[PDB]
Short mmCIF file of N, CA and C in Angstrom, two decimals:
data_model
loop_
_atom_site.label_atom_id
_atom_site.label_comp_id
_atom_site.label_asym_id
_atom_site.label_seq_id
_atom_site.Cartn_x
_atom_site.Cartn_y
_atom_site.Cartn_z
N UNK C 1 64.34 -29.24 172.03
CA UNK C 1 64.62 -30.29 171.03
C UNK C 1 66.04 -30.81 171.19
N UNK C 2 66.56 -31.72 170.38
CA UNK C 2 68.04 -32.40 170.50
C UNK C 2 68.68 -31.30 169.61
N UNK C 3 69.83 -31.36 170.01
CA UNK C 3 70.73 -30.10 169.38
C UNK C 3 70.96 -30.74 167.30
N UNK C 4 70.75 -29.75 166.91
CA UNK C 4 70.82 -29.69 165.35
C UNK C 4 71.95 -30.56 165.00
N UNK C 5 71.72 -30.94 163.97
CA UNK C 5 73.17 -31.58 162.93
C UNK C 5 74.19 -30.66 162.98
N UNK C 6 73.90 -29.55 162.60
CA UNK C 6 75.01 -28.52 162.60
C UNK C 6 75.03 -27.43 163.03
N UNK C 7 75.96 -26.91 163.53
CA UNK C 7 75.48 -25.67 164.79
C UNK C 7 77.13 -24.96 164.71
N UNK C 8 76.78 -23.17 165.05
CA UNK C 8 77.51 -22.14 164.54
C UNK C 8 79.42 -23.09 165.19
N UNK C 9 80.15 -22.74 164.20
CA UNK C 9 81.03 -22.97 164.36
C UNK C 9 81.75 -23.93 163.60
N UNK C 10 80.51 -24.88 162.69
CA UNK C 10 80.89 -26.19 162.45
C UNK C 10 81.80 -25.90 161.32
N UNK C 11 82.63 -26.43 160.42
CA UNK C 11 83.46 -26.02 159.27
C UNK C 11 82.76 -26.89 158.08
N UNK C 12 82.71 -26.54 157.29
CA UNK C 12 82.31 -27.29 155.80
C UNK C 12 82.71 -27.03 154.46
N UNK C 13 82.63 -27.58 153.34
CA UNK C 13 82.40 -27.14 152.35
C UNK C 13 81.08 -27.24 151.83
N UNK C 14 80.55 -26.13 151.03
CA UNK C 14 79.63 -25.40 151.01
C UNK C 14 79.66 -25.54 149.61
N UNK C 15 77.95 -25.78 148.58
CA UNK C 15 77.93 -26.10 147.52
C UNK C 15 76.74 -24.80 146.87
N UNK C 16 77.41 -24.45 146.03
CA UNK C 16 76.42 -23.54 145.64
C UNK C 16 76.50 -23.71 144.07
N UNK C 17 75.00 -23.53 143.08
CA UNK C 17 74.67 -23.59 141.93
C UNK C 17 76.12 -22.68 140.75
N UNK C 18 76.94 -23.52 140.19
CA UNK C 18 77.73 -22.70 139.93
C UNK C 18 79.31 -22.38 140.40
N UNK C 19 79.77 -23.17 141.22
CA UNK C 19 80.77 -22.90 142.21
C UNK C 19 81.12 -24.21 143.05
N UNK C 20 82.53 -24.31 142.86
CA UNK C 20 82.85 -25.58 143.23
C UNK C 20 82.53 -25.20 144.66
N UNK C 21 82.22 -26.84 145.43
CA UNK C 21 82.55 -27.07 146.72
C UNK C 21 83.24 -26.46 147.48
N UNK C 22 82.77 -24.99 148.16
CA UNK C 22 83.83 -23.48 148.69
C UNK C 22 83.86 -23.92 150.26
N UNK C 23 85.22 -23.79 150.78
CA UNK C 23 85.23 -23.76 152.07
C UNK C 23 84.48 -22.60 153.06
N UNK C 24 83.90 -23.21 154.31
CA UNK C 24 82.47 -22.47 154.66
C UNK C 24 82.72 -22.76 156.32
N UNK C 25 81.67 -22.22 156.69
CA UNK C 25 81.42 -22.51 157.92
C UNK C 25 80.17 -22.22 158.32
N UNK C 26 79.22 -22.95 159.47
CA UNK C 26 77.97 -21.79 160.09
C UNK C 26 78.31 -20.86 160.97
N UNK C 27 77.66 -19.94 160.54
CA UNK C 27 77.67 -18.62 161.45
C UNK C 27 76.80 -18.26 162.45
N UNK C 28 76.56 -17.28 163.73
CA UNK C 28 75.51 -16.93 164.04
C UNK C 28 74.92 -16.28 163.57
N UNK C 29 73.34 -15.93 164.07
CA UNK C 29 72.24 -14.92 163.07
C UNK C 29 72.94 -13.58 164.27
N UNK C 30 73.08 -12.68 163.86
CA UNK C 30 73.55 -11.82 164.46
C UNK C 30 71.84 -11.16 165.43
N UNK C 31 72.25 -10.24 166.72
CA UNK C 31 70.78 -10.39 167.29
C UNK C 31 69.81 -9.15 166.35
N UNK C 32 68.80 -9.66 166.24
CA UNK C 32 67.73 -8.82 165.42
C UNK C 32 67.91 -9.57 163.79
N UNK C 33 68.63 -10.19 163.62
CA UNK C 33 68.77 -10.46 162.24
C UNK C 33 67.75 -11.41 161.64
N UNK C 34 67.81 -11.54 160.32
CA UNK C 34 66.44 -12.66 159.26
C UNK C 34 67.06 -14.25 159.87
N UNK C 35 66.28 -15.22 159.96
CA UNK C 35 66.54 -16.39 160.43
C UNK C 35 66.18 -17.53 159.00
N UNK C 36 67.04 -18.06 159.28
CA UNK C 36 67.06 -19.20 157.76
C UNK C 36 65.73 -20.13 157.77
N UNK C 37 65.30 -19.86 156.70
CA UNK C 37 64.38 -20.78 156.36
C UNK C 37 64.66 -22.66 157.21
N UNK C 38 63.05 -22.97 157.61
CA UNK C 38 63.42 -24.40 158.10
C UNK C 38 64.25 -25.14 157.71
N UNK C 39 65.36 -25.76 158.19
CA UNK C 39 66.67 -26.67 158.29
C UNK C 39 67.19 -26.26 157.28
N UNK C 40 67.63 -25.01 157.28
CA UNK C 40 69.08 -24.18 156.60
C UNK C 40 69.76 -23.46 157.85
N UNK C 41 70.61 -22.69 157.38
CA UNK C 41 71.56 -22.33 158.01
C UNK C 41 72.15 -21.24 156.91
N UNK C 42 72.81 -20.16 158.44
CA UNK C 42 73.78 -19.23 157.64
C UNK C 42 75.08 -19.86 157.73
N UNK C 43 75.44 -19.73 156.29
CA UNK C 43 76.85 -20.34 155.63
C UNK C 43 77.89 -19.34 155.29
N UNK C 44 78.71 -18.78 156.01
CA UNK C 44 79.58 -17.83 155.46
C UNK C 44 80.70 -18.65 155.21
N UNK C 45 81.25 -17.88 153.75
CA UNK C 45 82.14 -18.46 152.60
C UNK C 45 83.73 -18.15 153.30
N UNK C 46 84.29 -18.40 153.31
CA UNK C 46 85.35 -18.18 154.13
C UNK C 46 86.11 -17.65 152.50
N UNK C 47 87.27 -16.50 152.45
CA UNK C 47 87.99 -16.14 151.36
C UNK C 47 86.81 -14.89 150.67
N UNK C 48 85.53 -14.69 151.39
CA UNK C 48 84.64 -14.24 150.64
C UNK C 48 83.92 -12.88 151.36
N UNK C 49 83.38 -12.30 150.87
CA UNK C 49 82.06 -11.68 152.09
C UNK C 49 80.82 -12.15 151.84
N UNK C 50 80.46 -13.24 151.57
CA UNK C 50 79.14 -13.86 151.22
C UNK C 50 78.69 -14.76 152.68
N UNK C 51 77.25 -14.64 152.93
CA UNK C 51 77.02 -15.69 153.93
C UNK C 51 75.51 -15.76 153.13
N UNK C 52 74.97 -16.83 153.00
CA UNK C 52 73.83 -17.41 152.76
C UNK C 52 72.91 -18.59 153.80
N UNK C 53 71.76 -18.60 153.29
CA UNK C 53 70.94 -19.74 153.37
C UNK C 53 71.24 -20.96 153.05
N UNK C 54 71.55 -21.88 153.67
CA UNK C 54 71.74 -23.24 152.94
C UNK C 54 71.38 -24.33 154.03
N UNK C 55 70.45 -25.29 153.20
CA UNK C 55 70.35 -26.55 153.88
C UNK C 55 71.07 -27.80 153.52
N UNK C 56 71.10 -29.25 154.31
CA UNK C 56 72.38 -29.86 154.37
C UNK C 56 72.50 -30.07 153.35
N UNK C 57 72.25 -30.83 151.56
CA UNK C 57 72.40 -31.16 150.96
C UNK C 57 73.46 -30.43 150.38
N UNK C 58 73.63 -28.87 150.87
CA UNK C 58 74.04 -28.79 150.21
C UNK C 58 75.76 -28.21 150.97
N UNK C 59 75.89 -28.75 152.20
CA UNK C 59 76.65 -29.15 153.06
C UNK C 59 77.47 -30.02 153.26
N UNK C 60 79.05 -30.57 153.44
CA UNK C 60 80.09 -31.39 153.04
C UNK C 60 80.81 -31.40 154.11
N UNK C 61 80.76 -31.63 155.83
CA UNK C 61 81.06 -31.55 156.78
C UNK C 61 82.86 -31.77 156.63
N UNK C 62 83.64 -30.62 156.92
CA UNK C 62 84.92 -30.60 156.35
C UNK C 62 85.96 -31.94 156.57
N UNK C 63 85.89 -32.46 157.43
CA UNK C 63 86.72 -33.78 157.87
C UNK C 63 86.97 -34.77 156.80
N UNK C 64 85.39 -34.88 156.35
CA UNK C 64 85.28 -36.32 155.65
C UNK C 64 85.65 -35.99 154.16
N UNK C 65 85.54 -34.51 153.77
CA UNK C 65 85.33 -34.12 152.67
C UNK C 65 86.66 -33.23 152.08
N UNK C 66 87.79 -32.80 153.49
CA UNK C 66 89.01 -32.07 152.67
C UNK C 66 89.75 -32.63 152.07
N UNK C 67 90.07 -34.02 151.78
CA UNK C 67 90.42 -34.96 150.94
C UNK C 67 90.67 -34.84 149.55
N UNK C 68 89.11 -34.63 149.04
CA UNK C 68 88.39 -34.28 147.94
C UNK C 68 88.79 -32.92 147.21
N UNK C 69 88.12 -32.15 148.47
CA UNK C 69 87.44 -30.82 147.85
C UNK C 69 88.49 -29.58 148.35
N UNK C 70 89.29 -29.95 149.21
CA UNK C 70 90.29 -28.76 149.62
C UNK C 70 92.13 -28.99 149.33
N UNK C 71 91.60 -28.61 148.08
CA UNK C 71 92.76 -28.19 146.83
C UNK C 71 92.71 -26.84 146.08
N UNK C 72 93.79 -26.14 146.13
CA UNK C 72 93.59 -25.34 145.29
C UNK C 72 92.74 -24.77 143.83
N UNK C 73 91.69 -23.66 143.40
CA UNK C 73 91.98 -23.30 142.24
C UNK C 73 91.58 -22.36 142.38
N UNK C 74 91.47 -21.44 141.34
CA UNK C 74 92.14 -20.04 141.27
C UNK C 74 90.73 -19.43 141.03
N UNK C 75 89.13 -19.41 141.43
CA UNK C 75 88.25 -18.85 141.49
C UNK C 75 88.82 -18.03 142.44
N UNK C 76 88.16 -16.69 142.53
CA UNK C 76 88.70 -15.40 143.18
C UNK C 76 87.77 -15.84 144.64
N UNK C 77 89.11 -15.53 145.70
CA UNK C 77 88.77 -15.97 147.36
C UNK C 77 88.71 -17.32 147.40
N UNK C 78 89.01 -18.25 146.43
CA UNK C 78 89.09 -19.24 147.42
C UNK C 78 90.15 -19.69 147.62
N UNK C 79 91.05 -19.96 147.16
CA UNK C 79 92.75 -20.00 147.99
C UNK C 79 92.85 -19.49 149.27
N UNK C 80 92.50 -18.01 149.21
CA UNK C 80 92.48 -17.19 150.88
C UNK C 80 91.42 -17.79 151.47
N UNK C 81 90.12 -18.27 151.01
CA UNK C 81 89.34 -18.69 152.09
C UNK C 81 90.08 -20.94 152.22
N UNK C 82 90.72 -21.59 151.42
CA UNK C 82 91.18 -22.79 152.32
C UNK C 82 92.42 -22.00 153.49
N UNK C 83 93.00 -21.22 153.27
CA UNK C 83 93.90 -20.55 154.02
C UNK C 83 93.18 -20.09 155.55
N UNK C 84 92.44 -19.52 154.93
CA UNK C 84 91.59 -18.95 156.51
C UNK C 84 90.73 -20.53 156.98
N UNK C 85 90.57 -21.39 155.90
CA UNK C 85 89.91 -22.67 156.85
C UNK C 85 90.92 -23.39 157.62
N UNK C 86 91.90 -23.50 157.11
CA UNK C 86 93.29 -24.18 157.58
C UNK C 86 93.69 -23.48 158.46
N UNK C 87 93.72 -22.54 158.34
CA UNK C 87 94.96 -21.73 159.33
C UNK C 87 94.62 -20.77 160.60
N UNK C 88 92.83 -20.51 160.21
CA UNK C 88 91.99 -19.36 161.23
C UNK C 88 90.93 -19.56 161.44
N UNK C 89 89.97 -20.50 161.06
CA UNK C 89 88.73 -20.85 160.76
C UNK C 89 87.80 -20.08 161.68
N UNK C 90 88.10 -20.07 163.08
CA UNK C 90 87.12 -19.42 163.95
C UNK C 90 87.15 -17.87 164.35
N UNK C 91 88.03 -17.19 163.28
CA UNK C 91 88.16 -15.63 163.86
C UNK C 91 87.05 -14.56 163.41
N UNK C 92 87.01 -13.16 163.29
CA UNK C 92 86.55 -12.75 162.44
C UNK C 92 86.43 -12.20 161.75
N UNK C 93 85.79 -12.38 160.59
CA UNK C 93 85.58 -12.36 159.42
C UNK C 93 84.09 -11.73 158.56
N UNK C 94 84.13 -11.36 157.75
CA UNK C 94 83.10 -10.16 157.19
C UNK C 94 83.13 -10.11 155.52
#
């Protein structure tokens, strides 16, 4: 097939029920691991140890969107996770 919209590495902010627009990224499925439901993706939270399921809607491809959404506030991990988007985005993380 043509390569996906978004593929491991990409940076985003990440929208979840409850929680502002969190800086994110896709991850790989590690080998043997559960695979995301059709056109989702694993989303690990950067500032966090969370990685989830998520499809695009609910996806904010970081470029167009740090403008907006990558400002400080004081929900627990996310300061350290714009820090690790800004400053480390591709290391790792758990």
């Amino acid at each position: 097939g043509m390569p996906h919209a978004f593929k491991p590495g990409d940076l985003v902010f990440a929208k979840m029920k409850g929680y502002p627009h969190w800086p994110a990224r896709i991850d790989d499925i590690a080998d043997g691991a559960v695979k995301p439901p059709p056109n989702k993706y694993p989303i690990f939270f950067f500032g966090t140890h969370e990685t989830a399921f998520l499809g695009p809607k609910d996806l904010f491809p970081y470029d167009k969107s740090k403008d907006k959404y990558g400002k400080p506030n004081k929900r627990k991990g996310f300061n350290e996770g714009l820090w690790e988007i800004q400053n480390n985005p591709h290391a790792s993380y758990s």
